[PDB]
């Protein structure tokens, strides 16, 4: 069973390959997760130089297997149940009055390390919009990720709305439609309707000169 692999501190590697309106970029992330406290501590670096999109727009794309599922809700943890073979996570992120991100990721164990390999494709963004014009504040709000079962594809679906704070006090709504499917042919946990309560804190490393993001995240399952 997959939950046994998450009882302690597990190292994480995140690799993103992106293209937003022709602008190519790569992000490399390193850190660790401790599912017992639903804690994520990571440092992401833009390996290609300065990013053409704001760092907050990439948080949801950049490992829900580290969510803390209370003991009474363990039978509803799809994410850990798909491990070690892993799962495919596909998202369509629709930014209100702007373009969209279509992401495809494979989340799985590579030895004792949990890896998140992502391909991101962004299209139809406005040149001076909130995203390409870098008008988003370097912070993150607390959200609820509503999960439901997709018994047809032996996985789950998630529907949530992310609100990015704009520099003028307004908000940029980023509608998310998620779909997860297991890579392996082993039995997975099909959950009842519930949500993941998320809290994210963004910061910078004072000694780092490259474009980066330090992320402290806490994810807890609720709702049942
Ligand atoms: Mg077109």
């Amino acid at each position: 069973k997959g939950e046994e692999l998450f009882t302690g501190v597990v190292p994480i590697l995140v690799e993103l390959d992106g293209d937003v309106n022709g602008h190519k970029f790569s992000v490399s992330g390193e850190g660790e997760g401790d599912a017992t406290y639903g804690k994520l501590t990571l440092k992401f670096i833009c390996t290609t130089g300065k990013l053409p999109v704001p760092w907050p727009t990439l948080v949801t794309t950049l490992v829900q297997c580290f969510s803390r599922y209370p003991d009474h809700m363990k039978q509803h943890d799809f994410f850990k149940s798909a491990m070690p073979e892993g799962y495919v996570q596909e998202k369509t992120i629709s930014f209100k009055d702007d373009g969209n991100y279509k992401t495809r990721a494979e989340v799985k164990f590579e030895g004792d390390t949990l890896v998140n390999r992502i391909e991101l494709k962004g299209i139809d963004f406005k040149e001076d919009g909130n995203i390409l014009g870098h008008k988003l504040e370097y912070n993150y709000n607390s959200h609820n990720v509503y999960i439901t079962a997709d018994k047809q594809k032996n996985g789950i679906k998630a529907n949530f709305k992310i609100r990015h704070n704009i520099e003028d006090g307004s908000v940029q709504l980023a509608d998310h439609y998620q779909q997860n499917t297991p890579i392996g042919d082993g039995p997975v946990l099909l959950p009842d309707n519930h949500y993941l309560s998320t809290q994210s804190a963004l910061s910078k490393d004072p000694n780092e000169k490259r474009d980066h993001m330090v992320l402290l995240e806490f994810v807890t399952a609720a709702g049942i």
Side-chain angles (χ1 to χ4, degrees), residues 131-152:
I131 296 82
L132 293 185
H134 295 271
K135 306 182 185 182
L136 302 181
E137 284 172 11
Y138 192 71
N139 49 46
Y140 218 83
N141 292 300
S142 304
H143 312 94
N144 293 312
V145 175
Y146 301 95
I147 303 171
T148 178
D150 171 10
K151 294 177 171 295
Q152 203 151 85

Side-chain angles (χ1 to χ4, degrees), residues 52-80:
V53 290
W55 278 111
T57 71
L58 301 187
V59 177
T60 61
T61 299
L62 295 167
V63 288
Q64 281 158 335
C65 47
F66 289 104
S67 301
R68 188 186 70 86
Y69 269 77
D71 184 79
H72 73 95
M73 285 181 79
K74 75 181 90 73
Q75 71 276 52
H76 302 292
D77 196 342
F78 165 78
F79 308 111
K80 294 183 187 55

Side-chain angles (χ1 to χ4, degrees), residues 91-135:
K91 294 201 281 292
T92 294
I93 306 174
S94 305
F95 295 88
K96 194 181 171 303
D97 295 352
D98 219 329
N100 67 89
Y101 289 162
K102 294 264 227 183
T103 70
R104 177 176 195 285
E106 283 190 36
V107 186
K108 61 181 274 64
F109 272 96
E110 288 297 339
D112 299 310
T113 306
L114 191 280
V115 173
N116 185 20
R117 286 195 64 157
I118 325 129
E119 277 195 67
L120 180 149
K121 185 73 177 305
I123 61 174
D124 288 309
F125 282 91
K126 319 210 282 188
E127 273 79 31
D128 217 82
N130 292 312
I131 296 82
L132 293 185
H134 295 271
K135 306 182 185 182

Side-chain angles (χ1 to χ4, degrees), residues 179-200:
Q179 261 169 248
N180 293 55
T181 313
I183 296 169
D185 72 21
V188 292
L189 291 169
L190 263 338
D192 285 340
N193 299 351
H194 70 284
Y195 62 94
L196 302 180
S197 181
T198 66
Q199 294 77 57
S200 314

